Design a protein around this ligand. Structure first.
Ligand SMILES: [Cl-]
Ligand SMILES: [Cl-]
Ligand SMILES: [Cl-]
Ligand SMILES: [Cl-]
Ligand SMILES: [Cl-]
Ligand SMILES: [Mg+2]
Ligand SMILES: [Mg+2]
Ligand SMILES: [Mg+2]
Ligand SMILES: [Mg+2]
Ligand SMILES: [Mg+2]
Ligand SMILES: [Mg+2]
Ligand SMILES: [Mg+2]
Ligand SMILES: [Mg+2]
Ligand SMILES: [Mg+2]
Ligand SMILES: [Mg+2]
Lengths: 228, 227
């Protein structure tokens, strides 16, 4: 009974890192619209399983972003399955999902899945390297990828700048072309000011790295976009 | 836009070939549910333009299957843009859609576009070679591509065997997993008996080059499928 078109803020947590249990409880009770567990590069199923067990008690939706088939774990409310639209490797577009349907077809059928169209626009991050993304893009290239996602009707279009602040103009123009898709933006949001700035254009802002860098400051990103 | 979930039979024409006498008009007035202009790599914008000018005048929906952005031509009722799901080359999955939107965004917006998830299951054909398709597939691979097609929201899953008939069991198993999209089957259908056989599982059967080889026999496939 989830609806990402109602969301405004999500925290994305890296199971490859460690967060104190009190901080994890606080993020879950923060008012964020979802807590997303990033099942990515170097991720292990054991860490995803421990995380699931800790966040599932809260009312907030818990989501697993499936970046590696081996790290899939039952128990989450939603499963986000990325397709890296600007990847030069078919494995990151279709390949890996076909292997998953072939090997875990029954599991996939029992879960609530949401496809994400990713556009990785920071050429210097671990994700661009892993996925061989053609990540050095002009604004018109980004807008064209968003149009591809809007055509395929993927429910989410995720503009990913990882650790850097992306060009706000690119967020605005991407949002301009999206009619049916929900625009998720991630990239350098570390405090209330940046969160507000980007929440003016993105439908949902994603705060992740910041949680491990300056927790109190990152926490304020929720009130920044959902508060009075 | 015309509703592909109500179709049962479509003819797919190669714009590089030409039907004699009034055969094109007979085909377009036959009862088929759509006339799709496809082609095999050597497709040119000029040949697509001439074909458009001929088929547009009939009530039957005319569709351009866009296999090259250089050959997009205005004037069709619907445009199908394939994503070759089993391609080893990203350009055949998302690359072209991106080019079309980057180069012809305004045109794309004015046209009715349908994404089509293709699975080329014949490794020995021009289409597999052109699209770098991993086409030597077991039935479980095909079924898994059909599950992905839906994951990606695609309205059409097109199981393609090009010039030969594909495994009927693959058609049946694919139809079984498609819960929300329409299954098009193309490959080697040239007469009524075979058209009827594959129509028991596919949602839409595509009859292609048989129209050039033996037109009268291929024309009978419409009634075979639709009664
Ligand atoms: Cl593991
Ligand atoms: Cl209709
Ligand atoms: Cl003709
Ligand atoms: Cl007519
Ligand atoms: Cl044929
Ligand atoms: Mg909303
Ligand atoms: Mg284990
Ligand atoms: Mg819960
Ligand atoms: Mg919104
Ligand atoms: Mg029907
Ligand atoms: Mg010309
Ligand atoms: Mg017409
Ligand atoms: Mg008309
Ligand atoms: Mg017209
Ligand atoms: Mg049907």
């Amino acid at each position: 009974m989830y609806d990402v078109t109602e969301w405004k803020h999500v925290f994305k947590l890296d199971p490859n890192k460690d967060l104190p249990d009190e901080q994890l409880e606080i993020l879950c009770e923060s008012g964020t619209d979802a807590v997303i567990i990033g099942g990515s590069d170097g991720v292990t199923e054991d860490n995803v399983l421990r995380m699931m067990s800790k966040v599932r008690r809260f009312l907030v939706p818990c989501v697993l972003e499936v970046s590696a088939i081996e790290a899939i774990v039952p128990g989450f409310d939603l499963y986000f399955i990325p397709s890296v639209l600007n990847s030069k490797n078919a494995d990151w577009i279709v390949g890996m999902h076909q292997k998953a349907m072939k090997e875990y077809g029954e599991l996939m059928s029992m879960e609530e899945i949401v496809a994400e169209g990713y556009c990785i626009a920071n050429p210097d991050c671990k994700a661009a390297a892993l996925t061989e993304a053609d990540a050095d893009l002009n604004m018109d290239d980004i807008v064209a990828y968003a149009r591809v996602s809007e055509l395929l009707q993927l429910p989410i279009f995720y503009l990913e700048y990882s650790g850097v602040l992306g060009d706000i103009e690119a967020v605005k123009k991407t949002k301009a072309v999206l009619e049916t898709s929900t625009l998720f933006y991630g990239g350098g949001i570390k405090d209330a000011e940046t969160a507000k700035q980007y929440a003016e254009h993105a439908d949902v802002i994603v705060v992740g790295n910041a949680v491990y860098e300056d927790f109190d400051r990152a926490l304020k990103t929720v009130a920044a976009v959902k508060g009075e």
